[PDB]
Amino acid sequence: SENIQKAIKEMGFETMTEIQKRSIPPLLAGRDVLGAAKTGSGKTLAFLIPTIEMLYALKFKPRNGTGVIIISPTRELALQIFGVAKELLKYHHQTFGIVIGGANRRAEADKLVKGVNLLVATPGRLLDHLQNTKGFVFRNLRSLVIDEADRILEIGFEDEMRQIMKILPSENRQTLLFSATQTTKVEDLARISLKPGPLYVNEQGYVVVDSDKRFLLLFSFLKRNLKKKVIVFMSSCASVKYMAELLNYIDLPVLDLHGKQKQQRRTNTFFEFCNAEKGILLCTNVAARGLDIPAVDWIVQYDPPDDPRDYIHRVGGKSLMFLAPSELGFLRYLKTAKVSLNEFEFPANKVANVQSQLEKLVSKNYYLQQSAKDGYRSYLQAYASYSLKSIFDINKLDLAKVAKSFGFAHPPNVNI
Amino acid sequence: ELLGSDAPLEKVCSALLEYESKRKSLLEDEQDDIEPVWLQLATLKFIGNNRKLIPYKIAIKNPVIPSSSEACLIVKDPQRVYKDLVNEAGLSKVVTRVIGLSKLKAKWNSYEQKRQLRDQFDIFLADDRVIPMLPRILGKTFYQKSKVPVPVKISKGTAEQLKREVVSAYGATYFNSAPCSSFMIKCGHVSNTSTELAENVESILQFVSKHIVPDGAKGIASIHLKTSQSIAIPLWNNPNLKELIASSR
Amino acid sequence: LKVPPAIAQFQKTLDKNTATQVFKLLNKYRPETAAEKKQRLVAEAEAVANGKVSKKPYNVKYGLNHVVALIEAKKAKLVLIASDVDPIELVVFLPALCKKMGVPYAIVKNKARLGTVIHQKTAAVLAVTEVREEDKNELASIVSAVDANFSAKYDESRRKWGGG
Numbered sequence: 001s002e003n004i005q006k007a008i009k010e011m012g013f014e015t016m017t018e019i020q021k022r023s024i025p026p027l028l029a030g031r032d033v034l035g036a037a038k039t040g041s042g043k044t045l046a047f048l049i050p051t052i053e054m055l056y057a058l059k060f061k062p063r064n065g066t067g068v069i070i071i072s073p074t075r076e077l078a079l080q081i082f083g084v085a086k087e088l089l090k091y092h093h094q095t096f097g098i099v100i101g102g103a104n105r106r107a108e109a110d111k112l113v114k115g116v117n118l119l120v121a122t123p124g125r126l127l128d129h130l131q132n133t134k135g136f137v138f139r140n141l142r143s144l145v146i147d148e149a150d151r152i153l154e155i156g157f158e159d160e161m162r163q164i165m166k167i168l169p170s171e172n173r174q175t176l177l178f179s180a181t182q183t184t185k186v187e188d189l190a191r192i193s194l195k196p197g198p199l200y201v202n203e204q205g206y207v208v209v210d211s212d213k214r215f216l217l218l219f220s221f222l223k224r225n226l227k228k229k230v231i232v233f234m235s236s237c238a239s240v241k242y243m244a245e246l247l248n249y250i251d252l253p254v255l256d257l258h259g260k261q262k263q264q265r266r267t268n269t270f271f272e273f274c275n276a277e278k279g280i281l282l283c284t285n286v287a288a289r290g291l292d293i294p295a296v297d298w299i300v301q302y303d304p305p306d307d308p309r310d311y312i313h314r315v316g317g318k319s320l321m322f323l324a325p326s327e328l329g330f331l332r333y334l335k336t337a338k339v340s341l342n343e344f345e346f347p348a349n350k351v352a353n354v355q356s357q358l359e360k361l362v363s364k365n366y367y368l369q370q371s372a373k374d375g376y377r378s379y380l381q382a383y384a385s386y387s388l389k390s391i392f393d394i395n396k397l398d399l400a401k402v403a404k405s406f407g408f409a410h411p412p413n414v415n416i
Numbered sequence: 417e418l419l420g421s422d423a424p425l426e427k428v429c430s431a432l433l434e435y436e437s438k439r440k441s442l443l444e445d446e447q448d449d450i451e452p453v454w455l456q457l458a459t460l461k462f463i464g465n466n467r468k469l470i471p472y473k474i475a476i477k478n479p480v481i482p483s484s485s486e487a488c489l490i491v492k493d494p495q496r497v498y499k500d501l502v503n504e505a506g507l508s509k510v511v512t513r514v515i516g517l518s519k520l521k522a523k524w525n526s527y528e529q530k531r532q533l534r535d536q537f538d539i540f541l542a543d544d545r546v547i548p549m550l551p552r553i554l555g556k557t558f559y560q561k562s563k564v565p566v567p568v569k570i571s572k573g574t575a576e577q578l579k580r581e582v583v584s585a586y587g588a589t590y591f592n593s594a595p596c597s598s599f600m601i602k603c604g605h606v607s608n609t610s611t612e613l614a615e616n617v618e619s620i621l622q623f624v625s626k627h628i629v630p631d632g633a634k635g636i637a638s639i640h641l642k643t644s645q646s647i648a649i650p651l652w653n654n655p656n657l658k659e660l661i662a663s664s665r
Numbered sequence: 666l667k668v669p670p671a672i673a674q675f676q677k678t679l680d681k682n683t684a685t686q687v688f689k690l691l692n693k694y695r696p697e698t699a700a701e702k703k704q705r706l707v708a709e710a711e712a713v714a715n716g717k718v719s720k721k722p723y724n725v726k727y728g729l730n731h732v733v734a735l736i737e738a739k740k741a742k743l744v745l746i747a748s749d750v751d752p753i754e755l756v757v758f759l760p761a762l763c764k765k766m767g768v769p770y771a772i773v774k775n776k777a778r779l780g781t782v783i784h785q786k787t788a789a790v791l792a793v794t795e796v797r798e799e800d801k802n803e804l805a806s807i808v809s810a811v812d813a814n815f816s817a818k819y820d821e822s823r824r825k826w827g828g829g
Contacts, residue, residue: 207444224445251508346444353532364721410739522799529802 001056003091004049011087011263017042022201024050027176032195035178036202039310040290044084047145047176052085054143054174055094055117062095062115065137069144069168070120071161073151074306074385075100075378076236076286081147082120083237083261094118101125102381102416112136123157123164130167141169146193149179149186151307155387158185165193204334204341206321211401213351214322215243218302220352221320222252222280228297229317230280231273233288235303235382237261240282242375243302246368246407249361250354257283285311303379304330304392312337320344326398329391355404362407376406377414384416419621419633424652428641429617430610436646437606448482450605451644455617455651457599458637460661463629464595469551471564471590474623478612479587480602485538487582489514490565492546498573505575507582512537517546521553530557540565541585564592589620593628600642617641617651634660666828671757673827677819678748679771683810687745687773690803691782694796696724698784726792727783729755735792736766743769743793743808747776750789759790760823769808771815 016024019041027033027050037043051068060067070085072078082098089096097116099108101124108125113135121129129136146152152161175194179186190198209217222230234240237258244256255273259265266287273281274294285305293299297317304327305311312334323330334341362368380402386392403411417423436451487510491498495516502511513536515524524533534557542550542565550558550565558564568581591601601624603616625633637657640648654660679687697705726732726741735741736759744763750756763770773779779788796804 220445224447342442344444345442349535350445350447353535525799526802 001053003056004052004088007088007090007092008049010090012267013045013263017045019043019201020046022199023047026199027174028053030054030174032175032198034190034194034198034200035176036180036182036200037178038180038290043147043178044081045088047147047178048081048085048088051143051145052088052092052094052118056092058142060094060117060140062117063137064117064140065115066112066117066119067140067142068118069126069138069141070118071123071126071144071146071152071164072120073122073148073155073157074286075102075122075381076284076306077148078120078122079237080286084263085118085120086261087263089118096120099125099129101385109133109136123152123155123160127160127163127167130164139169141173143174143176144168144193145176145178147178149177149189150181150183153183153185153189158189161189162192203319204315204321204339205319205344206323206331206341207344207346208325208328209322209346211324211398212355212404214302214324215358215405215407216351216353216355217346218300218322219247219250219252219354220350221300222247222254223352225298227278229278229295230298230300231288231293231296232280232282232300232302233305234282234284235306236375236378237284237287238371238378239303239375239382240284240287242371242406244282245371246358246362249365249368250358254280254282257281257287303382304386306382306386308333308388312339324397326396327392330388333388333391355407358407359409363409368407372406372408373412373414376403376408376412379406380414381416418625419636419639420652420654422652425614425617426610428649428651429614432641432643432646432649433606433610433613435649436643439646448484448607450607452480452605453603453608453613454600454642454644455603455620456640456642456648457601457624458639459597459629460635460637460654460657460664461631462595462597463599464593466595468593469559469564470547470567471592472623472628473567473584474589474591474601474620475584476587476589476616476619478604478608478616480589480604480616481539481586483510483586485586486536487511487586488533488537488540489568490520490540490542490546490550491516491570492543493518495519498570501573501575501578505578507578510582510586511541517549521549524553527555527557530555534558534561534563539586541568541582542566544569544571559592564590566590589616597637603641606643637661667826668828670824670826671761672753673825674760674819674823675746675748675753675756675772676827677772677822678774679811679815683771683807683814684773686810687743687771687807688778688782690796690800690807691725691745691791691793693800694723694725694793695782696727696784723795723797725782726794727779727785727788727790729789732790732792733759733762735794736762736768739766739768740794741768741792742795742804743771743811745779745791745793746770746772747779747789748772748774749776756789769811769816771811 019037023033023035023046035043035046047070055067058067070081072081078098078100085096094117095115096118097111098120099112100122103125105128108129112129112133115137130138177190177194207217234243240256241258244254244258247254255269257266257269259269269281270291273279285307299319301321362372380394383392383397384394399411489498489502489511491514493516495514499514502508502514524530540563544567547565547567554565566585568585570578570581589602591599601620603620604613608616621633625636629635636654638653639651641651642648726735732741732744736744744759746756746759760770760772776787776789779791780786782788782791793804
């Protein structure tokens with residue numbers, strides 16, 4: 001429809017990528033597709049445009065309930081997809097929503113009973129709502145989308161995914177599956193979920209810094225390297241938004257791949273950063289997943305990555321890792337991966353002692369305090385959803401020190 | 417020529433560059449700090465009646481303070497007017513913080529607070545009318561850890577004067593007068609080459625013989641060139657120092 | 666008679682010297698009187714009636730519901746509990762709530778003295794939440810004194826049944 005096109009051209013998207021060649025046309029006919037693409041291929045548009053067409057085709061309304069369920073393994077990936085679906089449904093009337101782990105479950109129940117046509121869910125939270133939440137209308141389910149199926153299986157949601165398929169209706173329902181790698185578990189899940197006869201588609205540096213000094217070391221490092229190119233990887237978009245806002249508030253102009261959750265602005269910001277010889281850009285791992293890394297003097301891993309296997313291949317100018325002492329177990333995993341590494345040493349004298357002033361600035365401003373809480377809460381929730389539970393254990397993490405890095409005198413009250 | 421009717425410069429200063437270079441023998445935070453050049457001066461008679469807690473604005477053409485060093489400006493009340501003037505002069509990247517005298521006296525009272533403020537900047541500049549107060553308020557935590565506020569005259573309060581004064585303040589070496597017969601003056605670092613170092617030495621010597629030594633260069637006993645750990649190579653010796661002291665006393 | 670430890674703790678109050686120093690800081694942060702508030706508001710009224718943006722005010726926090734909510738929010742730096750509240754169960758939990766929230770607290774004498782700071786006849790509890798930058802060291806020294814003269818002192822005595 002024209003509303004789809006008017007929304008698409010708003011994002012500045014022209015032509016159409018290679019993976020969508022064997023997915024978008026056949027999927028528009030309502031046939032099950034077994035997609036398989038690498039990272040950054042643009043699958044977000046692949047399983048959203050045809051499904052949004054099908055919402056418009058059936059004239060779905062909130063009284064009808066959920067029609068499309070999209071499953072993502074992590075909070076950040078689900079939130080990124082939800083942000084894209086919001087952009088695609090800009091000129092629509094079909095309600096959209098997201099349910100994720102660690103979020104306000106009571107608030108999600110109030111939103112689900114009202115009627116969310118396009119639901120982006122996580123395997124852990126969706127099973128909780130599908131079994132307990134009352135008034136959640138999903139008998140009219142028509143499309144099911146699974147993204148990064150292998151990631152879901154490795155996380156440990158095999159049991160949760162099995163109950164989802166047994167609970168959700170299977171008749172006259174389109175189903176999808178996307179996986180970078182095809183394993184035995186991925187194939188087994190496809191056989192029990194996808195319809196028969198589908199259309200198949202086909203050197204490291206680290207700094208051992210405590211949590212309370214994580215930002216102070218980062219800020220001092222960026223002041224020193226103001227005459228270079230810096231790109232920093234974070235664990236969340238909310239963490240990206242807050243640090244970018246805070247750094248601009250302390251006379252350290254930076255750029256972020258967040259903007260206003262506008263896809264066109266992120267591409268514009270990245271294009272400007274690549275063109276500029278000097279500058280600093282902040283982004284999360286998922287936003288930079290599959291993108292083209294320009295000639296950058298420094299790459300900084302401010303927060304530990306949620307996909308260590310993908311990160312160790314992406315790295316292969318200089319690499320930096322902000323590793324907490326409680327996360328020193330990641331060093332042993334690096335040896336098992338057979339990657340050379342060196343330890344960076346910094347003097348405590350040179351670190352900026354602006355923590356007292358940082359807390360005063362955050363407490364005085366409403367929007368800085370609001371952003372700081374959102375960044376702190378999202379960082380903790382992303383931490384609790386890490387694949388490496390043994391290495392990045394949230395319980396071992398000191399919450400008092402962490403909140404100090406965000407500009408908090410005391411740890412704010414965030415749940416999980 | 418002024419000091420002893422002779423100019424034994426250039427050769428000694430150029431040789432000192434190779435002398436320290438021969439004595440050369442992973443970390444994250446790095447800086448362009450270089451070992452300072454210490455110009456030792458000995459005077460036949462004491463040059464200070466009492467401890468003077470102000471630096472000497474020895475104008476120089478090769479600055480010893482790099483432009484990357486942060487600056488802190490201390491002004492009289494109100495601080496808002498001078499804060500606006502600093503911003504309008506384009507000195508935001510240089511003069512990072514402007515502190516009114518009343519605010520400096522009150523909001524920085526603890527020794528730890530004074531030390532934190534001291535370590536937050538590389539050079540301190542103060543209004544000439546508020547310089548006599550800084551002996552108090554700032555205390556020993558400032559005047560002993562090589563942090564002596566600079567008496568910058570901003571009385572009329574205009575942008576062009578601020579730019580000229582700061583540039584003059586940055587492009588100058590300073591020395592705190594103390595009651596003794598020997599002292600050291602910062603002439604530069606290894607980054608400055610031999611000819612620029614020689615120019616700094618002669619300019620300092622002219623200033624020292626003018627407004628520091630009461631009897632001029634004739635009262636200079638000896639002078640040597642030194643670094644942090646180098647030998648004090650004798651730049652020049654007075655041919656008549658021994659008899660001058662005997663006759664004077 | 667024999668009294669429980671939660672009521673016995675109110676007989677061990679802050680010493681005269683520390684209490685006198687505490688009220689020197691409190692008297693800098695008294696709330697403005699009903700008259701001073703009216704004068705400030707009418708002054709801004711004339712600037713509006715004829716023709717024409719401030720800082721956050723600074724004062725000591727008072728009120729039992731208000732202060733308990735500030736302790737639970739960890740917003741209070743110093744909590745001063747009256748020693749003679751007529752129903753004792755009004756403040757009998759405050760030392761325990763302040764211990765749980767890590768709030769430096771003291772039991773001071775003469776609830777009337779607390780009320781005088783706030784221009785009231787009587788106050789059950791006063792709380793200093795956040796003071797000006799000039800008084801950061803004065804409040805910090807008081808909190809250290811309350812730690813030694815009230816928390817380090819007694820403590821073992823507050824867990825014993827008093828009286829008898």
